[PDB]
Design a protein around this ligand. Structure first.
Ligand SMILES: CS(=O)(=O)NC(=O)c1ccc(NC(=O)c2cccc(CC3CCCCC3)n2)c(Cc2ccccc2)c1
Length: 192
């Protein structure tokens, strides 16, 4: 209430579309870091905003992303399903202490950073549009870790040094979450 998410991303141009193109991370390193918040959506569905990014940094292993899941509608729903849905719990280990974290860690392992086509790479406008929690399409990016504390999330990645972790958590702490607007995600249990 809310959660933090962390992990290395895949850079994709026109995701989910015919002209989909997975970009090599070094093609956008010049345009990193991204300190301003990008919306966090699900499978690149623009009407499923669940939170905001809190920094996208270049590191030794790739492009690390840290974000906050702030949508009360999504968090309440995900927690409810984590506690009552047998489908949700099926692919997860039995009897986890933190159902919500495991369910998200399992069902949405991929972080996909939407980018413009490499042909545009001095660009005119914003190189990045959003980050998506994805169930499919993960290649270079590692499995996403969800946690209640940012330092816990980042510290769970061994490929991220303490200096790198310090630089990341520096900007994450420099972000006031409450100031950010409410994501547009609506619970389908309320609408449909
Ligand atoms: C009440 S209803 O209208 O009949 N519900 C639905 O139609 C309806 C249709 C599809 C889905 N979800 C999926 O198909 C789906 C597939 C892969 C991954 C995920 C992400 C996670 C899965 C479980 C933990 C929360 C989200 N979701 C949901 C659950 C849902 C919950 C939170 C956010 C969006 C979606 C409801």
């Amino acid at each position: 209430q809310g959660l933090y998410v962390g992990g290395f991303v895949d850079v994709v141009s026109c995701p989910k579309l015919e002209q989909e193109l997975y970009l090599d991370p070094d093609q956008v390193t010049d345009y990193l870091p991204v300190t301003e918040p990008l919306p966090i959506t699900i499978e690149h569905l623009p009407e499923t905003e669940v939170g905001w990014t809190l920094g996208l940094f270049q590191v030794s292993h790739g492009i690390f992303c840290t974000g906050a899941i702030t949508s009360p509608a999504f968090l309440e729903l995900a927690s409810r399903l984590a506690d009552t849905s047998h489908v949700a719990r099926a692919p997860v280990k039995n009897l986890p202490k933190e159902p919500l974290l495991e369910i998200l860690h399992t069902w949405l392992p991929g972080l996909s950073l939407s980018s413009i086509h490499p042909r545009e790479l001095t660009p005119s406008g914003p190189v990045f549009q959003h980050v998506s929690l994805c169930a499919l399409g993960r290649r270079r990016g590692t499995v996403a870790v969800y946690g209640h504390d940012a330092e816990w999330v980042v510290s769970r990645f061994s490929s991220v040094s303490k200096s790198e972790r310090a630089h990341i958590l520096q900007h994450v702490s420099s972000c006031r979450l409450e100031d950010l607007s409410t994501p547009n995600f609506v619970s389908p249990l309320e609408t449909l």
